[PDB]
Amino acid sequence: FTSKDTYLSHFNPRDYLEKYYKFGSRHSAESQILKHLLKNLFKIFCLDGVKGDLLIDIGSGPTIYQLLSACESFKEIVVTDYSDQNLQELEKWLKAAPAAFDWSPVVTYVCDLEGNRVKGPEKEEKLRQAVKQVLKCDVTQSQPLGAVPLPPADCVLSTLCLDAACPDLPTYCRALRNLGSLLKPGGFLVIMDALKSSYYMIGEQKFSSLPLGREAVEAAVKEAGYTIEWFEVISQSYSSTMANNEGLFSLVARKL
Numbered sequence: 001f002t003s004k005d006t007y008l009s010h011f012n013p014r015d016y017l018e019k020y021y022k023f024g025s026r027h028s029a030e031s032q033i034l035k036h037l038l039k040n041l042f043k044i045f046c047l048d049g050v051k052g053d054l055l056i057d058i059g060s061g062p063t064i065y066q067l068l069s070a071c072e073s074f075k076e077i078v079v080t081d082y083s084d085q086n087l088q089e090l091e092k093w094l095k096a097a098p099a100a101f102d103w104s105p106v107v108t109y110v111c112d113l114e115g116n117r118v119k120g121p122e123k124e125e126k127l128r129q130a131v132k133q134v135l136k137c138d139v140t141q142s143q144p145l146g147a148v149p150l151p152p153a154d155c156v157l158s159t160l161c162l163d164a165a166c167p168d169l170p171t172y173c174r175a176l177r178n179l180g181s182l183l184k185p186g187g188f189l190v191i192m193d194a195l196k197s198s199y200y201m202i203g204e205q206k207f208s209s210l211p212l213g214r215e216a217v218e219a220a221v222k223e224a225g226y227t228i229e230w231f232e233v234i235s236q237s238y239s240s241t242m243a244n245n246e247g248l249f250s251l252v253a254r255k256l
C-alpha cells in the first residue's frame with residue numbers, strides 16, 4: 001500500500017488538480033463525477049438540515065470544491081491534510097494568490113445549483129472567511145489533529161481520503177472512530193469515496209486505494225459509533241487510465 005512518506009515525496013498537488021478538478025465542457029468521466037459530488041454536497045448542506053457552528057474537513061488535499069456549499073451552512077471551516085505541500089496549494093487560493101488554481105468553472109456550477117442567489121466573487125469571499133484554520137492531519141492517530149485545541153465540531157467531512165489513507169479495514173474502522181473524537185454526540189459525518197478500487201493515478205505516479213464494497217463501508221461506520229441516516233451508490237467510474245473503481249458512495253452518519 002502507498003505509504004504516508006510516498007504522499008510526502010510524490011503526491012503532486014498541481015498535477016492532481018489538473019487531472020481531476022479542471023471542470024471541462026467536454027464531458028469527462030472526471031467532470032461527471034465532480035458534477036455528481038457537487039450536486040450531492042449541495043443536497044446535503046443546502047436542502048437537508050446539515051448546518052452547525054464548526055465543520056472540520058479531513059484529507060482536504062489541495063481542493064476547495066467540497067467546501068463551496070458547506071460554507072452556506074457552517075460559520076467556521078477547518079481544513080486539514082497529511083501533506084504540507086497540499087496545504088501550501090490550498091492556502092494560495094485562501095490568500096487569492098494570482099498563482100492559485102483556477103476554480104471558477106466549479107464556483108460557477110455551485111453558484112448555479114444554489115439558484116444564482118450569488119455571483120462567483122462573493123461565493124468565493126464566503127468560503128475564504130469561513131476557513132479559520134489550516135492544519136496538519138493524520139487519520140491513523142487517535143488524535144488526528146495532534147495537540148491542537150478545537151471545540152467539538154458539529155460535522156466531519158472526508159472526500160476521497162480514507163480510501164487513500166487506510167491500508168485495510170481495521171485501519172479504516174479505526175480512522176472512523178478517531179474522526180468521531182472531533183465530533184459532538186449526534187454530530188454529522190459526511191464521506192464521499194470510491195467503491196471496489198485498488199489504485200488511482202496522479203500523472204505517471206500510482207497511489208493505492210482500499211478496495212471496499214457497500215457492505216464493508218456501512219459495517220465499519222456502525223462499528224465506529226455511528227448510525228447512518230442516508231447511504232447512496234452511483235455506478236459512474238473514473239476514466240480507465242486513472243482508476244479501477246465500480247462507483248462512488250456518499251453517506252450522512254451521526255455519532256451515537
Ligand SMILES: Nc1ncnc2c1ncn2[C@@H]1O[C@H](CSCC[C@H](N)C(=O)O)[C@@H](O)[C@H]1O
Nearest residue numbers: 059060061082083138139159160161164165
Ligand atoms: N493518513 C493520512 N491522514 C490524513 N490524510 C492523509 C493520510 N494519507 C493520505 N492522506 C491525504 O489524503 C488525500 C487523498 S486525495 C483527496 C483530496 C480531496 N479531499 C478530494 O476529494 O479530491 C491526500 O491529500 C493525502 O495527502
Ligand SMILES: CN1Cc2cc(F)cc3c2N(CC3)C1=N
Nearest residue numbers: 160163164194197200209243245
Ligand atoms: C480523486 N481520487 C480519485 C480516486 C479514484 C479511486 F478509484 C480511488 C481513490 C481515488 N482517490 C482516493 C482513492 C482520489 N483522491
